[PDB]
């Protein structure tokens, strides 16, 4: 609402404030109570198709421009308006209802009298909120206090930025050292924070405690923050709220909900202007026939009003009820269960998607990593050979009290169990205490915690193999053997993992034998020169990486009691330096990283969701280009692309390097252009430079690519890529995601599909369609999307044909019969009333199918036909227009020739010959017959014969029931329908359709 300013937030006291802060509520609604009606009415009557019916009714207030009754212009308009309002109201109420699950979650609040329970929507700035383990963070907070004695916590942020790594956060130093949690309320402290912005990974703030005799000021960064939408992984934490509601970092990265219109609806709207333009041209030309005769304008509007049914109100009604049937079918399909249709007015856009932009974390992957392959050079182990590694480990320790391949397996497993940064955590199961399970090393209470999920998966595998990690401190590790002996190790030097070095190291001392070993693990690129000569490391790493695995190289070096002293006494010297510490310390570490004994290669896989590989292949065979836009790091994203077969096994990958300016971006864009059939991997930082200077050049090069992978993408960058694809290509795009960082790109895309996340529902709540699994996307496109697009095209073009045949008939009647009369207008409406006996059979076109659901799934090439716009184009429209003119002329001119006796005897043959003609045309169009199509065509015949019997006795119209009436009606129908009943038969022979084979 206003320019954001910095705020001073006092601990407790949600009343010492300057401005007023927004409610901590999440809203996905388009309108509130006040803006509902103006918004719904304006979004409807701003299109020529809907505004046309409103101007017709308003013209009737003028007495000189009045024609017909007044309830024939407003009752159809009122019924149409009464469906848009009810349909829009139902959508808003359920959006409100589905927003109540997140907004009504119960948390705890520290008050002066004790902890009380608060709802998420009632949380205020300055409140002290308690968030427990595995719970969502309700608002943006500053980490104040934790219940653990390690003084930190881990955060899962996959629903905020799409990163698989856990984030370590630390509390404010003063608040963590207080004896009691309630002590935070008896101190005079405030937090000075920057104005709300969009940056998720940056924060500037200050913590000040006035009470202490020496005032204390701490600088705060992202390490002290707990943003909303994250999940606490360990223990209960206490924080103070800074931002609520629309000022949340997640919400500030989200756009406002909008009302979407489909491309199909934009094309029917264009056809109505052509139909209206043709009618006006006739009116303007017809008044030139008289060379103008005074008050010429009174005749044009009268002519326009009389032939106003060239655009029928049944086009709006039939399309509205058709879309109701499509959403009913999608909500009830048992082969894609759990699908919710939120935007029920665009089901036909699912059948013309050209670009599919998808998230990686949580959409394609299960967010679960597992150890898969161990390679010792001379032998490899997989999930089916892990029962032999357990025997090698058991053999050594069963023979401890009682080289070979058993001693080569043991050396590799012991290295994986020591070279990491994983700390075991014990928690009270309810009978056993945290202080008792720690002593006895119970397995059911143990949890492994680390920043890297890969390290946790490695440690979880050694436990299942025989070597368990039961304890860890800052200077000690404890391992349990198959014979339940505890091995104690002393951590002497640890070198943590950095994304620049891409490797990790540790030095340990065995307290049983006294030996000192140096362990190092890292990527194959950096560890190739560190290890001794071999002939299998580079070969097998490429084979491992080509399977979508994450490969680490493990090495060893035994140090004596003299080389460590030459290192320890030299490593400390570099630390106590004040000039260039980074390069001084580094040169001492790389002096130890030479001639290391290679041990093994480990492969870790991030598990895909069910049927991800077949689904991606099906979409690619349908002509849909798939891009992966993820907020995760480059290395993890490339592994998932190869694992999911987004990039083919033989495909070549070009990795875009870090460009920082206009000059560097031009060089790298020319380098990529010189490649052929290459997949593009580019980071968000390099993408910002490329889109700034070479937006056209970059976009054209990426659209010829087989696949494009964008990593470390901000939520605004994902929506920017979607917008440029729409502008530069003019084709529909689809966006699939599961987290809160994909809401921006789902709202921007033409068709937004949200996958229901495991720890969040924000993307599912903001999408047009919500699915529970990624594999449900294939059937939602090739079956439901294709049928909706094909049924709408056939149904809309038949209503237009029916209204154009009537207009042609009532133009021959108005000239070739009388050229002027008052009784004509009575027959003018009788002909137009013939659409009552075709009301049901034409609507039964929503039941039609060309192929079966098991055939559209097996042959994705049927989908590329819809991408060309074949169902509705200018060719199909023109053919339908020519048939309408031919059929209307044949019925009317055949009525005035076969029996030109009287007016009553002429509206009896033409009205009959038109119902039969339209009933026969529906039977011609239907490809697959349903049993409801049969009763619809046979009930309409019955109520027409019945209506020709009741009026037969009352009105003296015995002319109907004879033999003379029979042959003239039969002849006219045969001349009308049969020529179009033979061309279709010839079409099958000469030009068969692909779905027929
Ligand atoms: C027309 C607007 O077009 P534009 O060219 O400005 O494009 C708008 C272009 N944009 C979207 C790009 C900015 O749309 C409009 O006028 C705005 C919408 C007007 C809606 C008026 C609704 C009145 C209907 C009343 C029926 C209710 C029952 C009445 C019963 C009466 C019985 C006698
Ligand atoms: C043979 C084929 C080739 C043609 C040859 C030449 C023929 C020339 C004759 C007609 C052609 C020009 C008129 C075409 C129809 C209007 C087209 C138009 O440019 O539309 C302007 C907009 C509709 O834009 P949109 O929906 O495409 O934009 C969608 C995008 N968005 C909404 C975000 C902006 O606004 C509107 O609909 C207002 C449009 C004008 C008002 C409606 C006209 C019909 C209604 C009543 C007629 C008179 C009845 C009596 C009225 C008495 C009142 C007292
Ligand atoms: C005449 C007045 C028609 C009013 C239509 C608006 C309500 C449609 C409806 O009835 O709301 C959608 C239901 C809900 O379905 P559910 O929540 O029971 O499914 C688990 O879907 C269905 O029944 C099928 C109807 C889906 C059409 C939604 C509106 C499309 C325009
Ligand atoms: C009777 C006299 C004349 C009628 C003759 C028939 C005319 C055409 C009726 C079409 C119809 O009746 O379509 C019923 C629809 C869909 O039924 P389906 O047979 O296509 O089954 C779908 C399952 N599949 C696809 C596997 C077969 O059901 C729906 O739309 C239910 C929509 C409910 C909306 C209630 C109001 C909401 C506000
Ligand atoms: C003020 C608020 C009012 C709220 C509603 C109140 C309702 C009150 C009812 C009062 C009695 C009924 C009055 C009906 C008025 C319309 C009569 C009618 O049928 O028109 C037929 C119309 C053409 O009409 P016209 O007279 O030639 O011209 C009108 C005017 N002179 C004009 O040109 O301007 O030709 C058409 O255009 C057809 C129009 C209907 C279209 C229906 C299409 C089919 C829909 C789908 C049917 C199948 C559905 C199946 C569902 C599932 C079933 C199992
Ligand atoms: C002129 C209109 C009113 C009626 C048209 C004929 C009527 C009786 C309808 C009712 C049942 C319909 C049939 C239902 C089933 C099939 C099987 C299908 O594989 C070919 C079409 C065919 C054979 C349909 C032809 C048209 C049909 C025979
Ligand atoms: F799950 Al993502 F970017 F891969 F939000
Ligand atoms: Mg995600």
């Amino acid at each position: 609402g206003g320019e954001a300013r910095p705020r001073t937030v006092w601990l407790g006291h949600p009343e010492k404030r300057d401005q007023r802060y927004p409610r901590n509520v999440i809203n996905n609604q388009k309108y509130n109570f006040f803006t509902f009606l103006p918004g719904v009415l304006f979004n409807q009557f701003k299109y020529f198709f809907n505004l046309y019916f409103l101007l017709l009714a308003c013209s009737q207030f003028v007495p000189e421009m009045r024609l017909g009754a007044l309830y024939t212009y407003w009752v159809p308009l009122g019924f149409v308006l009464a469906v848009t309002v009810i349909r829009e109201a139902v959508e808003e109420i359920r959006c409100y209802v589905r927003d109540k699950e997140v907004n009504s979650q119960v948390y705890s609040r520290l008050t002066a009298r004790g902890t009380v329970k608060v709802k998420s929507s009632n949380i205020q700035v300055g409140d002290l909120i308690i968030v427990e383990k595995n719970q969502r963070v309700p608002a943006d907070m500053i980490f104040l206090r934790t219940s653990e004695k390690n003084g930190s916590c881990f955060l899962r942020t996959d629903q905020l930025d799409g990163e698989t790594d856990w984030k370590l956060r630390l509390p404010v130093a003063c608040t963590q050292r207080l004896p009691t949690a309630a002590d935070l309320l008896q101190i005079r402290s405030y937090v000075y924070a920057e104005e709300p912005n969009i940056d998720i990974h940056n924060f500037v703030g200050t913590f000040t405690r006035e009470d202490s005799d020496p005032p204390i000021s701490e600088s705060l960064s992202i390490e002290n923050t707990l943003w909303a939408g994250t999940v606490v992984a360990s223990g209960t934490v206490v924080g103070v709220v800074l931002y609520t509601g629309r000022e949340l970092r997640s919400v500030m990265n989200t756009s406002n909900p909008r009302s979407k219109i489909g491309l199909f609806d934009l094309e029917v709207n264009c056809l109505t202007k052509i139909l209206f333009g043709a009618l006006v041209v006739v009116s303007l030309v017809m008044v030139a026939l008289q060379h103008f005769a005074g008050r010429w304008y009174l005749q044009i509007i009268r002519f326009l009003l009389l032939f106003s049914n060239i655009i029928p109100i049944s086009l709006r009604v039939n399309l509205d009820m058709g879309k109701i049937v499509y959403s009913w079918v999608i909500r009830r399909d048992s082969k894609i269960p759990g699908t919710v249709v939120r935007s029920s007015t665009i089901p036909e856009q699912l059948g013309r998607i050209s670009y599919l932009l998808t998230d990686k974390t949580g959409t394609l992957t299960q967010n679960e990593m597992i150890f898969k392959r161990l390679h010792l050079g001379t032998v490899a182990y997989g999930l089916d050979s892990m029962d032999e590694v357990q025997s090698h480990i058991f053999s050594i320790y069963t023979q401890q009290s009682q080289r070979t391949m058993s001693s080569r397996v043991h050396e590799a497993v012991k290295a994986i169990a020591l070279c990491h940064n994983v700390t075991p955590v014990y928690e009270s199961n309810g009978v056993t205490d945290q202080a008792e399970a720690e002593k006895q090393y119970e397995d059911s209470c143990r949890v492994y915690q680390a920043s890297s999920p890969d390290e946790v998966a490695l440690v979880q595998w050694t436990e299942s193999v025989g070597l368990t990690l039961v304890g860890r401190d800052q200077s000690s590790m404890q391992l349990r053997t198959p014979g339940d002996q505890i091995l104690n190790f002393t951590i002497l030097q640890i070198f943590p993992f950095t994304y620049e070095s891409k490797r990790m190291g540790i030095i340990v001392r065995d307290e049983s034998t006294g030996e000192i070993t140096f362990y190092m693990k890292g990527a194959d690129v950096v560890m190739a020169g560190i290890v001794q000569y071999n002939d299998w490391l580079e070969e097998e790493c490429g084979n491992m990486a080509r399977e979508g695995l994450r490969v680490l190289v493990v090495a060893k070096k035994s140090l004596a009691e003299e080389q460590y002293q030459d290192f320890e006494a030299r490593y400390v010297q570099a630390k106590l330096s004040v000039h260039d510490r980074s390069l001084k310390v580094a040169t001492v570490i790389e002096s130890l990283e030479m001639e290391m004994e290679l041990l093994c290669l480990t492969g870790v896989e991030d598990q895909l969701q069910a049927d991800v590989r077949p689904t991606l292949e099906t979409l690619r065979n349908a002509g849909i280009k798939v891009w992966m836009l993820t907020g995760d790091k480059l290395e993890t994203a490339t592994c998932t692309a190869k694992n999911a077969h987004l990039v083919t096994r033989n495909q070549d990958i070009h990795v875009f390097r870090l460009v920082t300016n206009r000059g560097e971006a031009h060089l790298e864009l020319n380098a990529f252009r010189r490649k052929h059939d290459c997949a593009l991997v580019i980071s968000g930082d390099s993408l910002e430079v490329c889109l700034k200077y070479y937006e056209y050049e970059f976009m054209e090069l990426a659209c010829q690519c087989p696949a494009v992978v964008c990593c470390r993408c901000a939520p605004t960058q994902k929506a920017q890529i979607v917008r440029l694809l729409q502008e530069r290509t003019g084709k529909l795009t689809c966006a699939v995601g599961d987290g809160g960082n994909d809401v921006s790109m789902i709202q921007e895309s033409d068709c937004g599909v949200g996958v229901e996340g495991k720890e969040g529902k924000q993307a599912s709540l903001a999408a047009d369609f919500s699915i529970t699994q990624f594999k449900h996307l294939g059937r939602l496109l090739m079956v439901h999307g294709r049928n909706s697009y094909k049924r709408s095209a056939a149904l809309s073009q038949f209503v237009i044909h029916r209204s154009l045949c009537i207009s042609t008939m009532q133009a021959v009647f108005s000239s070739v019969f009388y050229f002027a009369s008052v009784p004509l207008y009575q027959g003018f409406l009788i002909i137009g009333y013939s659409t009552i006996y075709t009301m049901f059979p034409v609507f039964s076109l929503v039941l039609d199918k060309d192929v079966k659901s098991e055939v559209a799934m097996l042959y994705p090439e049927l989908y590329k036909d819809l991408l060309k716009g074949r169902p509705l184009s200018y060719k199909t429209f023109l053919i339908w227009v020519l048939i309408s003119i031919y059929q209307g002329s044949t019925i009317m001119y055949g009525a005035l020739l076969l029996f030109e006796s009287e007016f009553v005897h002429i509206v009896a043959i033409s009205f009959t010959s038109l119902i039969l003609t339209e009933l026969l045309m529906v039977a011609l169009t239907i490809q697959t017959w349903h049993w409801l199509m049969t009763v619809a065509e046979l009930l309409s015949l019955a109520c027409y014969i019945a209506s020709l019997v009741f009026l037969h006795e009352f009105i003296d119209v015995y002319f109907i029931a004879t033999l003379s009436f029979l042959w003239k009606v039969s002849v006219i129908t045969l001349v009308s329908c049969l020529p179009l009943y033979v061309l279709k038969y010839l079409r099958r022979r000469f030009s068969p359709p692909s779905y027929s084979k």
Side-chain angles (χ1 to χ4, degrees), residues 79 82-83 86-87 90 94 320-321 323-325 327-328 331-332 344-345:
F79 176 70
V83 177
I86 292 182
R87 188 238 296 142
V90 170
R94 305 215 263 211
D320 280 352
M321 317 276 90
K323 296 182 182 87
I324 292 177
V325 166
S327 316
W328 196 77
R331 286 181 175 104
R332 269 81 163 162
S344 44
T345 40

Side-chain angles (χ1 to χ4, degrees), residues 328-511:
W328 196 77
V329 169
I330 300 173
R331 286 181 175 104
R332 269 81 163 162
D333 193 20
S334 57
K335 317 219 220 145
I336 48 157
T339 313
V340 191
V341 187
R342 282 125 151 72
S343 294
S344 44
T345 40
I346 54 138
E348 308 104 337
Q349 278 208 131
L350 292 165
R352 246 198 300 200
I353 283 136
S354 292
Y355 283 98
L356 186 99
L357 311 111
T358 195
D359 175 46
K360 169 193 111 51
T361 302
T363 308
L364 295 176
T365 61
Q366 295 168 194
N367 208 48
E368 313 200 23
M369 317 189 84
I370 194 97
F371 182 97
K372 269 208 141 51
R373 188 100 30 82
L374 178 66
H375 214 296
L376 261 43
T378 36
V379 55
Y381 296 97
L383 293 187
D384 62 321
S385 321
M386 278 330 159
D387 56 286
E388 314 176 33
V389 176
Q390 189 165 23
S391 323
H392 283 165
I393 293 296
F394 199 64
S395 143
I396 296 226
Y397 292 107
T398 206
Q399 194 210 9
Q400 275 292 269
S401 43
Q402 151 180 40
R403 309 88 47 190
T404 53
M405 200 67 12
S406 276
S407 195
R408 296 229 287 112
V409 159
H410 177 251
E411 282 295 321
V413 175
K414 217 199 92 153
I416 305 169
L418 290 174
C419 198
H420 51 68
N421 214 335
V422 183
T423 304
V425 156
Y426 297 91
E427 301 133 299
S428 323
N429 244 354
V431 28
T432 327
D433 216 26
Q434 176 245 341
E436 168 63 26
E438 194 148 333
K439 290 282 298 293
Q440 280 276 285
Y441 295 132
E442 286 340 293
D443 318 82
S444 338
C445 330
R446 193 173 32 236
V447 190
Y448 294 120
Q449 295 206 143
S451 282
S452 189
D454 318 75
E455 289 180 338
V456 159
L458 287 164
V459 154
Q460 278 168 353
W461 171 79
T462 72
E463 168 188 21
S464 78
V465 121
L467 276 173
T468 320
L469 167 73
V470 286
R472 198 215 179 109
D473 316 318
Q474 319 286 350
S475 60
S476 183
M477 244 174 291
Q478 272 91 40
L479 291 186
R480 196 225 286 142
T481 76
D484 291 85
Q485 315 120 243
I486 303 276
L487 301 181
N488 182 58
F489 296 87
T490 286
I491 304 169
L492 298 160
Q493 302 281 351
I494 177 149
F495 322 115
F497 169 86
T498 62
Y499 272 104
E500 177 264 319
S501 63
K502 283 152 48 136
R503 66 183 159 293
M504 193 249 171
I506 198 179
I507 294 166
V508 289
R509 193 225 290 300
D510 201 343
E511 300 284 355

Side-chain angles (χ1 to χ4, degrees), residues 814-830:
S814 100
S815 101
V816 200
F817 189 51
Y818 270 119
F819 260 124
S821 74
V822 144
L824 175 129
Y825 187 68
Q826 275 67 278
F828 213 92
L829 308 176
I830 288 166

Side-chain angles (χ1 to χ4, degrees), residues 824-892:
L824 175 129
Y825 187 68
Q826 275 67 278
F828 213 92
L829 308 176
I830 288 166
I831 302 169
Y833 270 158
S834 57
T835 51
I836 296 299
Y837 301 103
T838 68
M839 176 144 309
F840 290 122
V842 197
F843 184 66
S844 79
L845 284 177
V846 301
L847 273 168
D848 205 26
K849 288 168 184 173
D850 51 327
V851 282
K852 269 183 179 272
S853 316
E854 31 164 14
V855 179
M857 287 313 280
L858 254 287
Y859 295 108
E861 67 247 28
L862 292 183
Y863 189 91
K864 344 179 44 140
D865 305 13
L866 317 160
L867 280 186
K868 284 152 195 161
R870 304 250 173 271
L872 201 147
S873 55
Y874 289 129
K875 309 205 216 42
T876 62
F877 184 60
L878 259 279
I879 300 157
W880 268 127
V881 156
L882 294 180
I883 299 165
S884 286
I885 300 183
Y886 164 77
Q887 293 197 343
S889 295
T890 305
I891 290 164
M892 257 301 164

